């Protein structure tokens, strides 16, 4: 992916003239409320948290920023990105914030800090500059309008070349016909936020909206104070991250076609992160008139029943949370992975070759990471691969094969016999 563009169309929190917003519409950005600070910090700290939040995805990427892009900063930025990534994809962000909303042309309004000091930029110009493949993140009040405009202009480029398009990824906040609703509970950069800290955001949304008493004593204060690093499983954040990624990958493998799943979720870390978070955010965002939009032909993964288990993973974990935060209680590992491995063994116990294959093979893929459940998963794989030859080939198709291959670089000679048995069957 090489390089990233961070385009900041921030008119120091100045509202546009084409809206009239309610009193609790002073919605923050990047967990920062720019309306409480002046230009030197209202424009700077947002960029700082963007840089941190995206280095958390890929610190290797060539991050470039453009605050108040006027004319030539845009051209220099996208030219540099083309030069670094002539063949590879280029990621490219939007906010559409500030004075009048994004339009079909592709204008920016940050020339000289005024409603009238706008700039008639064109999407066609950027598409011409981005002759290489591209990834776009449209976090805008009318992001679907921008998606439709970009699809039409990329189609225009494709038609001009035939008489970059067809290698483009696009993710956006909403549909062109649906503006982002005035919900005070949401941050203004909804689609940047939800793809950035999906764990606490989903927890907050369900705590607010899932009007259930199944988890008493849990409030948004606790959700904002959950300890963890998203990999330290001793705290709720690591366990929830692991379970959520497992659920999302499993549902996508079950539902999405292999041509798109095996490239989006495997050939790039950030693309996988954005699409996983996008499916979860889609499940959240369909509830109100904020219809998400996406470039690839992905069926509606939110409809899948396994998302219900997501709530259970929350319902168990949050049940411990009030004493995890307040009393410092050590987290108790969730039964999700044990239950799903039991489901895999149930499918094996059915003893039928040509039912629908096991849905939990991606769960096995993400359970081969750590010993404590990898041992059960490996025993189950040894049982599974004695089925017909399809059981072998699917194990290569799911992505278990690279993980077992990687597991065959360890020194655990007490574990190597099982691993070699399994790997001998997967490669057959």
């Amino acid at each position: 992916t090489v390089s990233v563009a961070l385009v900041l169309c921030l008119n120091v929190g100045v509202d546009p003239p084409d809206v009239v917003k309610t009193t609790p519409c002073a919605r923050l950005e990047c967990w920062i409320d720019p309306l409480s600070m002046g230009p030197q910090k209202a424009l700077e700290t947002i960029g700082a948290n963007l840089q941190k939040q995206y280095e958390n995805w890929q610190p290797r990427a060539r991050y470039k920023q453009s605050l108040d892009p006027t004319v030539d900063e845009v051209k220099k930025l996208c030219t540099s990105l083309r030069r670094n990534a002539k063949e590879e994809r280029v990621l490219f962000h939007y906010n559409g914030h500030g004075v009048p909303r994004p339009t079909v042309n592709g204008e920016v309004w940050v020339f000289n800090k005024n409603y009238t000091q706008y700039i008639p930029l064109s999407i066609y110009d950027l598409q011409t500059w981005m002759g290489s493949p591209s990834i776009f993140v449209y976090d805008c009040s009318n992001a679907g309008l921008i998606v439709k405009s970009f699809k039409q202009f990329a189609l225009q480029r494709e038609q001009e070349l035939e008489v970059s398009m067809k290698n483009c990824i696009q993710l956006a906040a909403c549909e062109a016909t649906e503006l982002l609703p005035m919900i005070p509970d949401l941050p203004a950069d909804l689609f940047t936020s939800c793809l950035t800290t999906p764990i606490k955001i989903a927890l907050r949304w369900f705590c607010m909206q899932k009007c259930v008493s199944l988890v008493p004593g849990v409030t948004l204060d606790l959700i904002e104070k959950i300890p963890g690093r998203l990999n330290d499983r001793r705290t709720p954040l690591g366990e929830l991250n692991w379970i959520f990624t497992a659920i999302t990958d499993t549902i996508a493998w079950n539902v999405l076609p292999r041509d798109l799943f095996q490239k989006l979720f495997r050939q790039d870390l950030l693309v996988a992160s954005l699409f996983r978070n996008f499916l979860l955010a889609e499940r959240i965002m369909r509830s109100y008139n904020c219809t998400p939009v996406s470039s690839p032909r992905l069926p509606p993964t939110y409809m899948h029943a396994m998302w219900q288990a997501w709530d259970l993973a929350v319902d168990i974990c949050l049940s411990q949370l009030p004493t995890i935060i307040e009393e410092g209680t050590a987290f108790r590992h969730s039964p999700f992975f044990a239950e799903q491995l039991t489901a895999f063994q149930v499918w094996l116990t059915m003893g039928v070759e040509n039912r629908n294959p096991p849905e939990q093979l991606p769960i096995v893929l993400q359970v081969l990471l750590s010993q404590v459940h990898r041992l059960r998963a490996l025993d189950l794989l040894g049982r599974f691969l004695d089925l017909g030859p399809w059981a072998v080939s699917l194990a290569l198709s799911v992505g278990i094969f690279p993980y077992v291959l990687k597991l065959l670089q360890s020194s655990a000679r007490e574990l190597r016999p099982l691993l070699v048995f399994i790997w001998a069957k997967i490669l057959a």
Partner: peptide, 8 residues
């Protein structure tokens, strides 16, 4: 290869 950390 792997998209996650592994106890290896």
């Amino acid at each position: 290869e792997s998209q996650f950390e592994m106890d290896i």
